[PDB]
Design a protein around this nucleic acid. Structure first.
Ligand SMILES: [K+]
Lengths: 139, 147
DNA sequence: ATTAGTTTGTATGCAAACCATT
DNA sequence: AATGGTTTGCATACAAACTAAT
């Protein structure tokens, strides 16, 4: 099995989902990654940069960059906890909350309308494989 | 009072895709960090080696990237000297890439290492599971490529 | 010593804008 | 004019190397 053809095959699906998300949110000045972050905070309230990394399958140095550039935009806020002043935490600002709320539906539909012509079975059958192989790959 | 139409979580599908994608390509970068080549430069080389010559538009289709992105990757990879850009007299807009001698020697020595760098990620993964992966990828990909 | 983060350097991710060719 | 490509101006990809803080 030519796992190159397999890689490029993901490359294709992956590319198409994320840059669709870019298009849908081009009007609001957000990258697909920004949108990924906002979707992730709006679910978890606060997150360590470290958890973001895990969640977005992304290195610390990149998440670092992204969250800062979001801070400057005034959507997220970083903070440090009294007990342990190393861990940096991320949560919404007022506008952050207001955005997530106003666009909750659009963010939800960007990803969802990508696969509309698929059936739920066809979707979950993919998720099963993904989770399966993903596990096989990890050791 | 809102009635938010709940559905199926395609955000989950993106993040998993992302994870499987990420681990695959950045594994390849480490595999070729000694060699001074990014995984993108390697994908190019694997394509040029298989197809002999390719136009920038053909590369976009193969790597699923945008003309400007790929224009960059080639120009930089020409600076290292593994890749010649040329134009055919019959339509001079089109720009093709193919190997230099140096880049052809590379592609020859390191074929096996490029082949096993991808295949070793799915070493622990056996045949059914891959066929399934392809099956589902190809199918869902067909449905997204409608609108 | 150690771990969480941030910075730095270089290659990219894109659309839009710009250019050569048809 | 209309493409195929290239440039540009950003936000990012990582890993190393630096910086707090435990
Ligand atoms: K990038």
């Amino acid at each position: 099995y030519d796992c190159f053809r397999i890689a490029m095959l993901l490359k294709e699906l992956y590319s198409k989902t994320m840059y669709t998300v870019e298009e849908n949110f081009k009007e609001n000045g957000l990258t697909h990654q920004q949108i990924i972050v906002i979707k992730l905070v709006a679910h978890n309230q606060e997150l360590t940069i470290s958890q973001l990394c895990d969640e977005m399958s992304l290195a610390k140095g990149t998440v670092s960059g992204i969250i800062s550039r979001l801070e400057q935009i005034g959507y997220i806020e970083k903070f440090k906890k009294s007990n342990d002043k190393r861990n940096t935490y991320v949560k919404f600002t007022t506008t952050g909350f207001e955005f997530a709320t106003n666009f909750k539906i659009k963010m939800q539909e960007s990803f969802d309308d990508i696969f509309k012509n698929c059936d739920e079975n066809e979707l979950s059958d993919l998720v099963k494989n993904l989770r399966n192989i993903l596990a096989k790959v990890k050791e």
